[PDB]
Amino acid sequence: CAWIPAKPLVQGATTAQPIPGPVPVANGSIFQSAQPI
Amino acid sequence: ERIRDLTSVQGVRENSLIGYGLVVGLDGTGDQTTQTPFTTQTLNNMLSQLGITVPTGTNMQLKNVAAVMVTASYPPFARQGQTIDVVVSSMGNAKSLRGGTLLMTPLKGVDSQVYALAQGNILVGGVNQLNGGRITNGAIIERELPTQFGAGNTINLQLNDEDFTMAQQITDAINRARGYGSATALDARTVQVRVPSGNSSQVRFLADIQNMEVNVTPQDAKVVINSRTGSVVMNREVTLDSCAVAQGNLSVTGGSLQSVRSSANLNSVVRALNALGATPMDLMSILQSMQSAGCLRAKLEII
Amino acid sequence: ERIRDLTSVQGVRENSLIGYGLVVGLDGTGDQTTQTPFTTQTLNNMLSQLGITVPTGTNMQLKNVAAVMVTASYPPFARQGQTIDVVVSSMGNAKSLRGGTLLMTPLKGVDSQVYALAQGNILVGGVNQLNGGRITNGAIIERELPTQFGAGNTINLQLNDEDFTMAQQITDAINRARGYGSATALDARTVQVRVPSGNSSQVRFLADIQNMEVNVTPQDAKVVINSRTGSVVMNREVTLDSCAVAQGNLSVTGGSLQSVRSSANLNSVVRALNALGATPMDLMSILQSMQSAGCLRAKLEII
Amino acid sequence: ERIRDLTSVQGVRENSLIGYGLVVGLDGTGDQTTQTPFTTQTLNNMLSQLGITVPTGTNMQLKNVAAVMVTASYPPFARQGQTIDVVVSSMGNAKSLRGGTLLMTPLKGVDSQVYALAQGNILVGGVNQLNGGRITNGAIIERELPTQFGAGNTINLQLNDEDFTMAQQITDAINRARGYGSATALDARTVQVRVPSGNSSQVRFLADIQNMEVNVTPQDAKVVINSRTGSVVMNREVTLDSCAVAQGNLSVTGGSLQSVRSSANLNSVVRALNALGATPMDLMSILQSMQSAGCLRAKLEII
Amino acid sequence: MTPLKGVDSQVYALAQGNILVGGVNQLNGGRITNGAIIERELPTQFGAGN
Amino acid sequence: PNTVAPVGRLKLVKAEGNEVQRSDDGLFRLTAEAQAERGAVLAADPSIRI
Amino acid sequence: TLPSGLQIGTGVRPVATERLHSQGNLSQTNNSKDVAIKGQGFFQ
Amino acid sequence: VMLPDGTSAYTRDGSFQVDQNGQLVTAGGFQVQPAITIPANALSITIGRDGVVSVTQQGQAAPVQVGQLNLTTFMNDTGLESIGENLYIETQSSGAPNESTPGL
């Protein structure tokens, strides 16, 4: 049937939310690098 | 006096600003806009912002306008309202920026935030460079940076050149002047100074320190060779060892194998090397071979 | 006298204004309007505003009209009705602005608000620049800016060049003149002055302060090299160390490796460097190599 | 005498007027009307207004007519019936306005209201400018502006150049002349004067004040560089610091690195700079580099 | 404005300035003095041990 | 054919004709006065086309 | 402001030779491995 | 047309090719001053009795205009100086040239 609930091939949430970057440390620098892996 | 000429202070640094702008007023020595579309596009953006909408897909060929990149240096402790100097550089098929004027241009940091606004008249030297100019007091500071100067009881003097004896000399001088336990060397490039807590007391301390005088210790023997410009420089620590040298067209003033005596000071080195009668061009090759053999008791750097 | 030549006052700054305008009255040295559509379009806008509607899609080729950008500097504490000086610059394929007249033009800020209205006769020098001119008292101020001058008990004198000794000197001078606790240095670029509350008392204070005299302390040794114009400048703090130099076609007046003695003052430096007999063009390369080696005890800046 | 040469009065300002007109009587040096349609269109409008209707779509090629823009300056306190001077400028492909006559033209403000009517004979100089002229007493005032002069007990003298010492000097002079509490400085550009209420008493006050004499205090050291015309000007406050200078083709009258001594007054500066033997063209580059280094103790402005 | 990476592809310095070409000599190569500023620091075990 | 590359540029000078004298080998050189006025070696003007 | 100046020519010289890249006609070859391009293009 | 040095010279004959960029140049490399640019995939180019130049494209109902070819006129053309290669340069003999659209 077409009314029986089936799960989709691509499961879970299909979107992501950007996260705010860290607060810049108050040295004399403009270049701020978030923790780099 | 001297320490201010050898070190910098931690937290007191410069940053860089860059922006895009237009230069108007040229005597027909601007871009050929049929090959630089961003020129006409940004001119249309400016006109639209001012209140004039030019129809799209129309003919437009200017001659008195050039698209430029503006670069500046954000100074330490900069306050809003002050002024800095900017450098203006052409960026497409322009002939000259002789008598141009820079229109309102925002200067962004690396985080894409506006830190200064630039506008003024360009001074081109007037051979000389035509597509590059400098504007004096051409930008005004709009944003300020936070800093943690004055917080804590420790500053760091950062040497300009690594050395252990030099860091120890600076430490000993500061301790001789400003009390027993005032300074401490961390490594070959840092001196940690204890300062009273506050903002004015630290300024008094750094004003007292920056004008002290220290005697520079002998550095490393080194020979700098700039092959691109064709220059050779040897500081006062270079020595030599006795050895023979041969090179094309060079002879004794005798065969082609010339002797070189030992040399303790620099005058002896200059004399013994001038004895060979070689241009700097050949002197480079001679010095490289001598360093490879073992005569040259120095440190060769090709810059 | 002196302090007014070293610092600025916080809140007393200049702004920039820009606008678009037309210049009429040229002797056939205006735009070729078949390639600058905005010229004819804005002329039609003006004619329509005045009461004359020219049909669209008609032939129109002018010669005595040019489209220009007008730039001006909004001064501190500007009051409506006053006058400022404007700079007029061509913006498309015009030959000259020799005897032109600038029509009514509004000058906007960065927030797109009208701050001044510009109109007058252009003065072109009359080689010289033809596509750029200046109008004296060519704009009138229409809008005023708010400000918080006179509110509070603290002003900031902002130095033009960062230095700790200089800020301390200015602070000590103000404290010696205007009482014990009148000033306080915040950093290498700011001096915080306590002033009485009000508007006239602060003017009296700043009038007393701005004419004081301070003795400038020795700055940093630096050498400025402008490669675009071909110039070299060395302030009075540069020193040298004994070392040998070689460069193409330069010789002793002796081989090609010339000596350079130690130099404490600037006269000795000038003498020792003139001894090499080099044009400034080669002097740039020599100085770069010497700074890389360690002879030049200065700070090289390529501007 | 002096104060009238330093300040303006609040509410006493000039405005600008602009209008469109026709100039007739030229010796075949008018527009080529086949490319300026607005000329023939406005001529037809005028003829129709007078009582003659020319059929449309007919051939019409004139030679003794030119379309012009008329500009004028609305003076302070202007009364209807008075006369002002106008400037007439060609606006399309005309050769000369030598012996032309300006027909009846209304001059509008920025609110598109008629403030004056212009008509007269043009005076072209007769190289000189042909497409621009001036008419003396060529316009008559038709509308008057309201004003609030004479209402209140406070006027504002607005300085022409910002300065705290200057505002304080003017305030002190007015207080020394016209009683204790007559003036008060608001900022670096305004002096608030208390005047009796009325219209004639304020005129008596401003007549007494405007002719006072004040001694101008020393201004800021500044150097003006006009690169477009090729000129350099230095006021009497510029000083110098000892430093060395090198530039292409310049030599000692000695090598290429020339010394410059310290200079306290302006005569010393002129002497030391003339010693280098440089044209103004090179003097610009030298001054820019010196200001960047630190010798020039002035304020460089590129106008 | 140019970032200078190490061998691990991390930014250690930022470079910007005016080039000084000798002005035969080399035209396609130049050197900038004090043209880069350090942005990252390296750890080290100096001072630890005997 | 798309590998054709510029490799150099000729130096063309403009001489009026009344200030140039022939030499023994057969190469015209500037006279003393013209040489003093225009410099020892002429400058490659861009107005000449060949 | 003379009416003209005295100028003398020197001759003629072939400067360039172009090809008219128009569309030619088509002939039916009856073969099955012959291709004719209609429009603009080039085989590689 | 524009000479390499920077000055402007006038021609009369019409034989135009398109350079690699797309601009309209004469046989010899000299670029036509109005600088008409014809983009790629130009199925057909049209230059009418007026200066308008219109190019068609794939599946376009109406051709797109890519510029106009205005031409210059002289008060006295006999006084023009004739340098080689089918070019004339303005001189004092001929009056100041004026450019116009064809047919006007």
DSSP string over D72-116: EEEPTT--TT-EEEEEEEE-SS----TT-EEEEEEEE-TTS-EEE
Residues of H in contact with C37 (CB under 8 A): none
- Of C296, B303, B12, residue with least CA distance to E37: B12
End-to-end CA distance of chain A: 49
The pair of structure tokens assigned to C179 is 């009482």
CA–CA separation, F8 and F10 (whole Å): 7
State the DSSP H helix or E strand holding residue D175, giving kind and residue range, or none if neither: helix D164-177
Residue F47: list chain H partners with CB under 8 A: 5
Residue B143, chain A, CB below 8 Å: the answer is: no
Question: Does residue D46 come out as left (phi exceeding 0), alpha (psi in the -120 to 50 range) or beta?
Answer: alpha
Rounded Cα distance between C23 and C31, Å, is: 10
C301 reaches E (C-beta below 8 A): yes
Q: Rounded to an integer, what is the distance from CA B221 to the centroid of its chain? A: 24
Backbone angles phi, psi at C69, to 5 degrees: -105, 130
Strands B83-90, D190-193: parallel, antiparallel or unpaired by DSSP?
A: unpaired
Could you give phi then psi for residue C237, rounded to 5 degrees? -110, 0
User: How big is chain D, counted in residues?
Assistant: 303
Residues with Cβ within 8 Å of residue C172, at least 6 apart in sequence: none
Q: Output b/e per residue, G4-30; b: 16+ Cβ within 10 A.
A: eeeeeeeeeeeeeeeeeeeeeeeeeee
- 3-class DSSP assignment, residue D117: strand
Triad D269, D273, D274: Cα angle to 5°: 115
SS3 category, C156: strand
- Cβ neighbors of E35 (< 8 A, separation 6 or more) are E15, E16, E17
Tell me which amino acid residue F40 is: A
Distance CA C174, CA D195 (A): 37
- DSSP element (H, E) containing C244: strand C243-247
Please give the Cα distance from B13 to D171 (Å, whole number): 44
Decide: residue B215, CB within 10 A, 0-12 exposed, 13-18 middle, 19+ buried: exposed
The two most distant CA atoms of chain G are separated, in Å, by: 74
- Matching residue, tokens 């550095």: B219
Return residues 2-61 of H near G (CB < 8 Å).
15, 17, 27-28, 43
Calpha distance C67→B36 (Å, rounded): 21
Place of tokens 């937290």: B11
Chain C from 204 to 233: CB within 8 A of any E CB: 225, 227
- Whether the CB of H82 is below 8 Å from some CB of chain B: the reply is no
| Cα B284 from Cα B290, distance rounded (Å) | 10
Return the beta strands (E) in chain D as ranges.
7-9, 15-24, 65-74, 83-90, 101-108, 114-121, 132-141, 155-159, 183-187, 190-193, 223-226, 231-234, 243-247, 258-260, 300-302
Three-state SS sequence of D186-211: EECCEEEECCCCCCHHHHHHHHHHCC
B–E CB contacts, 8 A cutoff, strictly below = 31
Q: How far, in whole angstroms, is CA C274 from its chain's centroid?
A: 33
**Shortest CA distance to C101 belongs to which of C83, C115, C88, C85?**
C88
List chains adjacent to chain H, taking adjacency as at least 3 C-beta pairs closer than 8 Å: B, C, D, F, G
HSE at residue C157, side-chain half, CA atoms within 13 A, is 26
Chain B residues lying within 8 Å of E2, measured CB to CB: none
Closest CA to E42 of D106, B96, B189: B189
List the single residue in B with minimal CA-CA distance to C252: B274
User: Do residues D301 and C85 lie in contact, with contact meaning Cβ atoms separated by under 8 Å?
Assistant: no
Query: CB distance H93–G5 less than 8 Å?
Result: yes
Give the full edge-to-edge strand order of the sheet including H64-68: H45-47, H52-55, H64-68
Ramachandran region, residue D79 (left: φ > 0; alpha: ψ -120 to 50; beta: rest): beta
Q: How far apart are CA B125 and CA B129, in angstroms?
A: 7
Specify whether the CB–CB gap between C204 and D213 falls below 8 A: no
Residue C153, both tokens? 């008990």
Asked if A30's CB is within 8 angstroms of B74's CB, the reply is yes
User: Which tokens belong to D200?
Assistant: 């004639």
Give dist(CA D64, CA D28) in Å, integer: 5
Q: Which of E41, B142, B174 is nearest to A27 (CA)?
A: E41
Q: Tell me how close the Cα of H67 comes to any Cα of chain B, in angstroms.
A: 6
Which residue is closest to B28 within chain H, CA to CA?
Answer: H6
Task: With beta carbons less than 8 A apart as the criterion, state whether D190 and D161 touch.
Answer: no
Q: Cβ of B137 and D228 within 8 Å?
A: no
List of chains touching B (3+ CB pairs within 8 A)? A, C, D, E, H
Interchain contact, G3 vs H93, CB within 8 Å: yes
- CA angle, C162 as apex, C157 and C164 as ends, to 5°? 90
Tokens 């057969």 locate to: F26
* Beta-sheet pairing, D155-159 with D183-187: unpaired
Answer whether B8 touches A (CB < 8 Å): no
Q: Which class for B91: exposed (0-12), middle (13-18), buried (19 or more C-beta within 10 A)?
A: middle
C-beta separation of C28 from H96 below 8 A: yes
Helix (H, G, I), strand (E, B) or coil at H3: coil
Give the residue carrying structure tokens 């006999």.
H78
- Our CA-based measurement puts residue B261 at a distance from the nearest CA of chain E, in whole angstroms, of 32
Of C28, C32, C59, the CB nearest to H99: C32
Q: How far does Cα D86 stand from its chain's mean position?
A: 15
Closest-CA residue to D135 (of D181, D171, D176, D85): D85
- Amino acid, single-letter form, for residue H102: P
Q: Which of D126, D151, D79, D135 is nearest to D102 (CA)?
A: D135
Farthest CA pair distance, chain F: 49
CA atoms within 13 A on the CB side of C193: 28
Provide φ and ψ at D232, rounded to 5°: -135, 135
Is residue C34 within 8 Å of H99, Cβ to Cβ? yes
Per-residue b/e over D198-234, b at no fewer than 16 CB within 10 Å?
eeeebeebbeebeebebeeeeeebebebbbbebeeeb
H79 secondary structure, DSSP code: G
Q: CA-to-CA distance for B128 and C230, rounded, in angstroms?
A: 7
Neighbouring C-beta atoms of residue D29, cutoff 10 Å: 18
H or E, element range at C43 = helix C37-50
- Cα–Cα distances (Å) from B42 to B61, B103, B109, C182, in that order, read 14, 12, 21, 51
DSSP 3-state assignment of C172? helix
Give how far the C-alpha of residue B116 lies from the chain's centroid of Cα atoms, to the nearest Å: 22
Please tell me the distance in Å from D137's CA to the nearest CA on chain B. 35
Is H104 part of the contact surface with chain D (CB cutoff 8 Å)? Answer: yes
**Cα gap C234→C271, rounded to integer Å:** 13
**Rounded to 5, what percent of chain A is helix, strand, coil?**
0, 0, 100
Cβ <8 Å between H28 and G4: no
